Symmetry: D2
Subunit: 268 residues, 4 copies
């Protein structure tokens, strides 16, 4: 009806109702989009969470590390949206880093296997999602991934920040490939969102000093955001993703939109 | 009706029908916005150009270097939109650099007075427009200025690039001030647009080697843009500005949106 | 004898013994360089300060806003270093912004004349120094200016940050011109140094809230500097400038070296 | 005797005499440094290459993917430099990406195992080298890794660019850890160097179009370098690394020094 009217959009990464992807999906639906959802390891839970969406959406299984899931993904989406229909939009809202790559675990002590797994899911999967789905995307389409500005190092995020640096770089290459399809690829760099995991880390699940650091990070973020930053509100990020999913940023690709309150533009 | 429905938006910088601001204004109107226009030194011409807009819009005089124009500006806009109404949107699409600051004139030979004038109109005026208009802007409002990525030096643009670097920096401070009003401030970094002036420089008005360089710049831009770059089409930039004028990028301020085909994200 | 042995280097910007340029000059002398100094409005004071340098150095008057000073500068330097001798090194350590462009004076209230003056001295003069001196610089030479990272807005520095953004951009163009002479042009982005002016602003000369903000800026800087930041020690910055003046960064030009403790690479 | 007099420096990554690390090692020796070298899979060859160095240097085996090599590394270096002696300097000049991650092999077709291996050797190993060696580094020490600016995507370099983005990010975290030891960590972003591998790719070993693209990349680099770029001369990069290994950039860490001719600062 409005922003995304008629668009067909795959949204990955809903796991709980505080998933950023939950709000992206909600807002996209409110904006006229038709969704296909993907979920990874807790499918029954995703479905039960997604029941709360403004509209029903087919849910497909996708373990971004499973090569068969990816191989079959486009066929499954075509099944879900019907033959001869294509996606206009793909949202990657997927990220993971083993606990060793994060928080109080010393940066040097994260074993490569762990880091590799995190980079697989958090960075490489952006490309492999774009590989699976570009064949079934319309000209004018839009792939959006979720980013957390890794331009500068920060406490606790450790190897996830490295993963995000890799993602940003993947995104620029995906844009090169997507452009052949008339498709844009972009990242939304969000401010900290109080996701279940984030609340758990502030509460110390990855060590006390990590939790204290991330709490300071959050406070500093809202302080230097010229328009403030509400970490309990994923809506301004969901809207931003929708902005990129829409026809309203048609000359932007390979790029990063910062939905962070303007915090990254301010030193103090 | 759509993107900018109900919004009231001042658009500066229409001088010809190939002004970027012409397309911004056209698109904003198509998207439901109500406009107040400003024009500088050729008011009769601006009016005659703007007659072609989808809707009529009050045109106000604003010479960004005239302190009285700025002092009176908000009152004049309030007159134009009616008492008790405010602006939701301000577009700065203003830039100028004396010929000595550009093209074949050696970078070192631009006299400071010339450079100063260019920086006044091209950079400082962004702040002084925000000063004049923030008192008459609604919470949730949006100031947008036009940028040309000055991260790296380039032939011919010389002191205008310096002016743009200054603008980017002004924009981050304006965001600090705007945030007090619940207002975002952002720049759109556009790709090269074949504006009358740009066509004139490609044709050699600022020297042959400058024209040859800018023609190469343009070709290179479209080449590395993963989705291409059409310098004859200001529409993708107008849409981008509208995107920023809208409620769809609500967490972005002090920032730069690149409507350049993705060209800045690619080396070759 | 060591780093700068045999090099002839103009150093501007010594005004007190806590001038960054004082330490640059001291270190360059310790490293074998032969200096010509320039001073602006307090020549007797500069001379008396410079008497403390490890070696005597001719002092020349240069008001970067005085076109005759600039016109005569190279002849005066040639007089000072002797006919047929050239400079290997130029240090721009010059900056000024009227009080209205800074601190507690609202960013919007700085009159353009004031801002223009600040940008003249702080940014444009880098080019006009390079114009005066490149004709008398040797292949392999090095121009270095002093920068304060203006990538993000910050309290109190207001229009000086804008000035620094303009400088960074000027530096990239100066590099284009300098390269014709076989000369590098680069900026050193220093951390906050407790210069007389800086101490005065921390003490509130530009308003209490500005002083409080700059004190917080300083503390935050040392906190996120992975190797710390000592604002009372200009030596690590002087060394960095010498590094750039030397043959040891021969492939770096148009660029910015950050002598800030690594602070800019860290978010928190 | 000069720049690195008395310093003890581990240099990894010599494999042929056109290895960047060969020139780093040569220059460091010329500058007074005492070296320990490491070599990976062709030890007899490294030794035979290193015989040509100005001075003899113990060569140690280090397969950055071998956890036992890393576990033993510091003991082996202490053996080589003698008990109670420490390193002042560590050079990481290590990089690898399987052919599938590069050139004409479509970016989407690089299998994760391949990419992971490349990121292991090219990015993660920078951290794991810093882990092995920081316990045996002196305050004031310097770790330097080799970077190729991955800020923008480019043809052919594909997943190696992603690897370099990951490296840059690793470097910022390593700086955090190194600072505890009084140690700096920095990257040198070099211009293209005609290394054996690079010559082989220009000659088409990774596909014709890749070779054509990299040849264009190289030409463009020298064109926009304000001081030119000689891809056949690794010396300006070796000097830059030495600059970072020295006491002359003491306030720089977590950072990237661009030894690229200034090319990255120029658009065209
Ligand atoms: N929460 C925050 O503060 C910020 C998060 N982000 C990013 O937003 C994106 C979404 O995460 P959030 O909503 O915060 O957390 P979340 O935990 O709600 O979402 C992460 C999603 O990744 C999915 N996932 C993990 N491994 C997978 C695999 N092998 N295959 C398929 N899917 C897999 C999870 O199932 C989950 O649905 C992530 O990329 C995250 O890094 C970006 C900025 C800030
Ligand atoms: N044409 C291009 O390739 C690109 C242009 N831009 C920027 O877009 C903005 C709009 O310019 P264009 O549409 O290209 O050219 P234009 O010439 O159509 O618009 C420039 C406008 O600035 C106005 N102006 C000049 N001095 C003024 C003053 N003292 N007071 C008030 N207004 C004044 C002019 O009247 C004109 O309307 C400028 O900021 C320009 O630098 C940004 C990227 C690319
Ligand atoms: N103090 C700090 O924390 C930092 C300073 N910087 C920069 O370092 C450079 C040196 O300044 P500082 O040593 O801090 O202060 P300073 O006050 O000791 O040096 C500023 C110099 O600029 C000179 N100057 C001013 N107007 C002039 C004109 N019209 N012509 C010629 N010279 C003129 C002054 O005489 C003075 O010698 C400046 O560019 C400053 O912005 C950069 C980063 C940090
Ligand atoms: N050649 C170029 O144009 C540029 C190269 N660089 C970087 O310079 C660094 C040095 O490479 P180059 O001198 O060009 O090539 P090179 O092939 O001479 O050096 C690469 C080195 O990495 C070592 N290596 C590979 N796998 C290893 C492992 N598992 N364990 C230990 N060492 C291993 C190789 O043995 C070789 O010595 C690399 O990081 C490269 O990416 C950076 C910019 C430009």
């Amino acid at each position: 009806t409005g922003l995304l009217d008629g668009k067909r959009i795959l949204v990955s990464g809903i796991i709980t109702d505080s998933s950023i992807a939950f709000h992206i999906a909600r807002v996209a639906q409110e904006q006229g989009a038709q969704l296909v959802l993907t979920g990874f390891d807790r499918l029954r839970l995703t479905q039960r969470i997604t029941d709360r969406l403004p509209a029903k959406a087919p849910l497909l299984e996708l373990d971004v590390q499973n090569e068969e899931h990816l191989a079959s993904l486009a066929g499954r989406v075509t099944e879900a949206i019907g033959a001869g229909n294509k996606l206009d939009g793909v949202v990657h809202s997927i990220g993971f880093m083993p606990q060793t790559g994060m928080g109080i675990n010393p940066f040097f002590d994260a074993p490569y296997a762990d880091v590799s797994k995190g980079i697989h899911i958090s960075a490489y999967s952006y490309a492999s999602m774009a590989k699976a789905l570009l064949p079934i995307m319309n000209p004018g389409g839009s792939i959006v991934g979720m980013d957390f500005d890794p331009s500068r190092a920060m406490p606790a995020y450790n190897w996830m920040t490295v993963a995000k640096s890799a993602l940003e770089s993947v995104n620029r290459f995906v844009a090169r490939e997507a452009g052949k399809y008339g498709v844009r690829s972009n990242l939304v760099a969000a401010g900290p969102i109080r996701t279940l995991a984030m609340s758990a880390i502030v509460g110390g699940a990855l060590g006390e000093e990590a939790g204290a650091q991330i709490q300071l990070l959050e406070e500093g973020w809202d302080q230097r955001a010229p328009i403030g930053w509400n970490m309990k509100d994923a809506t301004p990020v969901a809207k931003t993703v929708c902005a990129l999913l829409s026809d309203w940023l048609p000359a932007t690709t390979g790029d990063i939109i910062y939905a962070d309150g303007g915090a990254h533009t301010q030193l103090l």
